[PDB]
Design a protein around this ligand. Structure first.
Ligand SMILES: OC[C@H]1O[C@@H](O)[C@H](O)[C@@H](O)[C@H]1O
Ligand SMILES: OC[C@H]1O[C@H](O)[C@H](O)[C@@H](O)[C@H]1O
Ligand SMILES: OC[C@H]1O[C@H](O)[C@H](O)[C@@H](O)[C@H]1O
Ligand SMILES: OC[C@H]1O[C@H](O)[C@H](O)[C@@H](O)[C@H]1O
Ligand SMILES: [Ca+2]
Ligand SMILES: [Ca+2]
Ligand SMILES: [Ca+2]
Ligand SMILES: [Ca+2]
Lengths: 121, 121, 121, 121
């Protein structure tokens, strides 16, 4: 299991120690407050009022938490995933990423605290 | 495990099938958009800008998800809890509740989708 | 979780810190070598060749590991239990006992090492 | 989880469905009665009084339950493993095997019943 923080200004993403293997069941819980630029902050579901201006994940709001598994496409995480299984061909290290437009992470602030574990089978 | 939806207008909150006993380790993941009155909506951490005007839980923002376990006081859930152990002597059925001021739930809207499971211990 | 030793000459049994609650799923693994009297020793399944001369558990061999949950009757453990659930109305502290005839524990020797955990639900 | 029986007379051993990946935590519980030749039978810890005359696993008794994980050497299982983690660089499918001297399985009898599960990690 992994516990850390995903900084909103970290464009490359936070690599975790979790390697998602075929058949794994995982749970993720995310919490905290961050911004993609404004004074206002949002939690891991991001800002439902802000338009998509070229986000790394089009299936979540700006300011949301998303992930890749290996070099997969971005997968929405938001507040977390409960006993979740990836698509069959998806595997590799889990990288956690704040959802913003490429090149615009430098003005971000805050972070999410994220915990990941593998469930029993 | 238990999966269900907690309505923001339900002042009594929603009882779940989960009985918490001493020693138990639990994980909760909560998702969704709800409001305590305004046309805006907030996730399970609620509205960090809004003052406490007599909330059922003073340790969480207005519009946050909270819970009671048996005869306990309110405990913040927010986005969830990862492999969490309850305070000393806490025991009984988990009830989930939207954090608002008593008597003011009538103008609330939306819901949270919540999963609760017991972990290994 | 709990780990410890169960002495073959302990007629009262070894109380554990595990309280079995309704709906709990438990796993037990036991190891070691013990005797009810003879110079030979046996594992946690006991001695399949020896007759029952008034054992505390008639559903296990002499020299087997058994348990009580609360003030239940004796339940065979043997080498252990995998993701096991108790019958209705069985609850309380787990006590681990060597299966021998009452009043005859004085000539017993050896012990079993036992691990107990609660599983995910 | 996987469940099955490991025949004492099966020199190839029993290939399970469990794939051990780095970081995985496993639990095994084994039960039953088997022999390496004599008319008497022993549990999964084997015969503590028999010498090692060239066993496939020199770290367990003759008649004990052992395993290999992918390409690895033999590892003792005995009555089971509780929340066990393998070394660095040990991975793959788990094969269960009765511990006897190669070429001498033909006179063996009985079997062990084995449950294997992956724990939370
Ligand atoms: O059947 C149980 C009895 O077995 C005898 O062999 C032993 O010496 C007694 O102490 C008692 O344990
Ligand atoms: O739409 C995303 C965009 O939003 C605002 O304009 C921010 O100031 C930028 O940094 C970028 O995050
Ligand atoms: O502070 C809580 C309070 O917030 C606003 O006033 C809402 O309109 C009320 O219904 C109540 O929820
Ligand atoms: O030591 C192992 C050896 O034990 C006895 O000799 C059995 O008869 C053999 O088949 C072999 O299993
Ligand atoms: Ca930005
Ligand atoms: Ca309200
Ligand atoms: Ca005795
Ligand atoms: Ca043999």
């Amino acid at each position: 299991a992994w516990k850390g923080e995903v900084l909103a200004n970290n464009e490359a993403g936070q690599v975790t120690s979790i390697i998602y293997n075929p058949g794994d069941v995982i749970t993720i819980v995310a919490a905290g407050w961050a911004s993609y630029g404004p004074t206002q902050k949002w939690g891991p579901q991001g800002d439902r009022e802000h338009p998509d201006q070229g986000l790394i994940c089009h299936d979540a709001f700006c300011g949301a938490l998303v992930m890749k598994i290996g070099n997969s496409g971005t997968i929405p995480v938001n507040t977390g995933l409960f006993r979740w299984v990836a698509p069959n061909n998806v595997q590799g290290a889990i990288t956690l990423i704040y959802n913003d437009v490429p090149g615009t992470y430098g003005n971000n602030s805050g972070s999410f605290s994220v915990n990941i574990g593998k469930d029993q089978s």
